[model samples]
Target: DFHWEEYLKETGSISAPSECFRQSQIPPVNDFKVGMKLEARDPRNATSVCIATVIGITGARLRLRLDGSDNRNDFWRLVDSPDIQPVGTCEKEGDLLQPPLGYQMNTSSWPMFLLKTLNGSEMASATLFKKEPPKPPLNNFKVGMKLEAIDKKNPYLICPATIGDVKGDEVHITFDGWSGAFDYWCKYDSRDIFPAGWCRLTGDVLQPPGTS
Candidate 1:
């Protein structure tokens, strides 16, 4: 069990105010369905767009698995992330979709693999995608503010966090319950950090802080 009130007192820290968060827009609703096919930038090879399948969804995020890759490398992205797009988008723009890094089969099989992967697959509707919100005009974060952050080490989990320090364009995030083991610094508008109550809005599980 974790109690935020007690934890704040123990650490002599305070959570950031809501206005300090840079997520200025409401979270967009995700209408993507499992098994939908889309083109996504390979997280490992950002310059390469690969075929991906929607494996799961929570809130505004979609869990994506590259069609020719193993499940271990699955990733999550917001519906509005520039990294994903409806199928045929790449081809229409005269871009060739590349195979994912570490594609499971022999290189020569990729063309056939892509053919079968998309055949009869459901492509996510263009209407389901929303334009990415504009970035906050400036860094307005301050230390001691509270928010929810994704644990990069365990990307599936969203946990309570505090702004431990602010430096230039970076903000240090300290996880509440796990001590300093999972802390990190990211840009003020990083997608990994969210305003308090984000999990509630998205139906993500927010882990409690550790007792020390």
Candidate 2:
């Protein structure tokens, strides 16, 4: 369901962003947390932009799900690999993200706007902050538990996500929604994907329709 090949066709291109970064260079003290915000590609409209959330983590790569758009809902992204960035880097004085011509970006641009305000001219991807977390619904999650989650990058494709781990207040989740095609994990402190109860009410659930 969430194939990279498919993503290329849908988005028009899979070329990496013009900007480049190395994950190894990021310090270990950033305290990567669930729900921390990021910037990523919009799955549906490739030329457009969106805000992705830290939904899962695997070693150095932070698994990301898109926030606002809905083209391929279950897609997963890797952090520090040109696709991901710290929260407010886009709006810094020289770092302003130029909007894709004639398009509505899936992710909100507010985070970038915030960056512009705080650091003014000297802002970089490193200027963003890991946001304070909201209370997690850890009581409701368990391994093998299944649910639907939005792929913030590609909002159209909705696939199955499974609980992979549980550590303290965080849950490790795998996007098994799309066969072996697109599998990845991230921490549970994400705000992009919702718990079962919340997904049910929001209609943000990404599972197949009809099964209650």
Candidate 3:
């Protein structure tokens, strides 16, 4: 068995921890669209899955918001054509997964989490993901479109990074000099994009186009 280093060193256990990135596909544009319904991994209950709504779009990534769950920490799936399928349409038909009874989230802090989830003042969405407005790829990124992105590896505030590339459905993101390339092929919306300082956080600088 693989030695459980993190647990042994930190928490003192032999169980394996969850991985952040999963091997999934970047859905094809023609097959997906905004408001489309699908199933995704439940953030609070990583072992189980939940129904999700196509909330935003950026390049080839589909921004997702879980139904019947807190809207904060909006989740994203980096997928390709092979990973995406129609709602209730996984190839392994008839298999069901159950959600954990009590997710790791401190529900005792439910009031705070709920309040923060409901707060309207924060540019929560903007500081989370880019906007992939419904339309053909037009290379419209203009150097200042506020966007939420994986902070490369920042632990605090999943909010990080912004658009640094806009070639067709491909958008390059910058997170404190570290960059992540993304594409837009799924059926998701793009109204949540925001400007810098929107998340009240700063990431890496955006590189000029064509730079290696």
Candidate 4:
């Protein structure tokens, strides 16, 4: 129920230009399809790689659901995200694919679970993945700059945000409508933030600021 066009006019503000975005290049195309299996770094355990399934696709991103995890834990990642790759790529690189942080069944079942999960399953084509874009050379964000950002706590929603503070390499992302309740600090090159109009480009719903 949030209207970004009127809100931008009311605030006398403009969305940050695309060049101000952190990525050096424009967003990549998402060619992933449902039912494809891949390896992804578990967001909950960033250092660990796990099996994931491509459950949906939107613009340049893929909606991934980790193997052995509940449906509620699904997440979205850009097609160029370094954290995801074709299945078996982990093994090729001598890395292990671990069960998700909260594997639903007994631990002993993991081996069979993995075997069954990949048997005859469609694997994402390696060519569909692209190298992640390089980060901008410097922390170019300025305070009061408006952009679209994901709420880390509510990962499904993309909301309007403003840079509340900028330190050496970190920026405070303040949600426009929800006050400071959902604000957090992240690196300037963090992927969670995007230029204004990104949601429109990605077919994502952009939420309005909180009334309170």
- List, residue by residue over 1-212, the lDDT tens digit for candidate 3: 21223323443222111111121112223224556556566656665554456776544456666644555656555324222333443225764433223434654654454344334422222213322223423344533233444443331223323444455545555542343443222111232232322222222232222223
lDDT of 2 by residue, 1-212 (tens): 33334544553433221111111222222345666666665555565445565665433335555554333353454333444556454444245443333334433765564354333333224534332333443444566555445554454444445566666655555565244334445555443334333332323324442222
Candidate 2 residues lying further than 4 Å off, grouped into runs, are: 1-141, 151-154, 166-172, 175-178, 209-212
Q: Please say which candidate is ahead in lDDT: 1 or 3.
A: 1
Question: What shift in Å separates residue 144 of candidate 3 from its native position after superposition?
Answer: 28
Tens-place lDDT per residue, model 4, 129-190, is 97777777778888888888989888777788988889988989999879687999999888
The lDDT for every candidate, in the order shown, is 0.83, 0.44, 0.38, 0.83
Instruction: Rank candidates by TM-score, best first.
Output: 4, 1, 3, 2
- Tell me, what's the RMSD of every candidate? 2.4, 16.0, 17.9, 2.0
lDDT of residue 204 for candidate 4:
63
Each candidate structure's TM-score, on Cα atoms with residue i matched to residue i, is 0.89, 0.33, 0.35, 0.90
Off by over 4 Å in 3: 1-31, 79-84, 90-92, 97-212
The local distance difference test score of model 3 is 0.38
**Strongest candidate by TM-score:** 4
